[PDB]
Amino acid sequence: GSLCGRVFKVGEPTYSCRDCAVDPTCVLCMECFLGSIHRDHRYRMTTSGGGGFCDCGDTEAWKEGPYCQKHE
């Protein structure tokens, strides 16, 4: 219920839950991933080359658990 929305900087890890992502571009930042249900799911970590943004709290990006503990 609050906004992460943050942009990724070069080198930062991004996390896409394989079980819950609507498509492979759906990603959580490290803080949101580790505070979400998806930390216990199958996931893809991809290092950012810069750009994009965290999808925490976008119900269109996730089949379940769209919000991490901080942003719910």
Annotated binding site: 4, 17, 20, 29, 32, 38, 41, 53-56, 58, 68, 71
**C-alpha triplet 62, 56, 50: angle, nearest 5°:** 110
What's the closest the beta carbon of residue 23 comes to Zn ion, in angstroms? 14
Closest CA to 9 of 37, 40, 30, 39: 30
What's the closest the beta carbon of residue 60 comes to Zn ion, in angstroms? 15
Asked if residue 3 lies in contact with residue 57, where contact means CB atoms within 8 angstroms, the answer is yes
Which one of residues 8, 26, 27, 32 is an interface residue with Zn ion (CB under 5 A)?
Answer: 32
Q: Which is nearer to Zn ion, 20 or 61 (CB)?
A: 20
